[PDB]
Design a protein around this ligand. Structure first.
Ligand SMILES: Nc1nc2c([nH]c(=O)n2[C@H]2C[C@H](O)[C@@H](COP(=O)(O)OP(=O)(O)OP(=O)(O)O)O2)c(=O)[nH]1
Ligand code: NA
Ligand code: NA
Ligand code: NA
Length: 156
């Protein structure tokens, strides 16, 4: 079984809107997403999530809730991406554009699925329903899912 590398993903989810960022370079460029990246040596996963949110959007938070975990496999890539997904409703500061991301708010009846990773269509609705989840998706390239599993869980 492949080795895995730890990543974070943070969704600022308010009652009528969600904050996403347009990825300007790198992995997932051209897609709207939450904020996140590789966990670094010595930090907890939650602290890595807080750090990435600050670096990519300028925001800080008073509390981060773990809402899901998704493992990604790409054909032809040796490592799995083990993504720990967090949400918060209560941020401090305004979002700012970074080298990585252009933040923008979306109303919750305008979630931009066509410009998001394809797997987000499956798990994002669970997030919105306050349901914790575990997932796994195998991709060929950026657009094609070959296999996936998704489970509602009581504990992430
Ligand atoms: N919504 C969504 N997010 C995903 C998927 N796959 C995936 O890795 N992610 C997230 C996890 C991370 O937030 C981000 C990938 O991390 P990254 O490449 O931006 O990491 P980084 O900031 O450390 O990278 P870099 O500056 O070194 O280029 O994308 C997916 O299918 N859907
Ligand atoms: Na980053
Ligand atoms: Na990133
Ligand atoms: Na999509």
């Amino acid at each position: 079984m492949k080795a895995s590398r730890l990543y974070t993903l943070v969704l600022v989810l308010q009652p009528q809107r969600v904050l996403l960022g347009m990825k300007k370079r790198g992995f997932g460029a051209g897609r709207w997403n939450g904020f996140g990246g590789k966990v670094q040596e010595g930090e907890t996963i939650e602290d890595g999530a807080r750090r990435e949110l600050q670096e990519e959007s300028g925001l800080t938070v008073d509390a981060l809730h773990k809402v899901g975990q998704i493992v990604f496999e790409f054909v032809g890539e040796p490592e799995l991406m083990d993504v720990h997904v967090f949400a918060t409703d209560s941020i401090q500061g305004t979002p700012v554009e970074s080298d990585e991301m252009r933040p923008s708010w979306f109303q919750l009846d305008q979630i931009p699925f066509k410009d998001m990773w394809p797997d987000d269509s499956y798990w994002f609705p669970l997030l919105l329903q306050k349901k914790k989840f575990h997932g796994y998706f195998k991709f060929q390239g950026q657009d094609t899912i070959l296999d996936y599993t998704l489970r509602e869980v009581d504990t992430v």
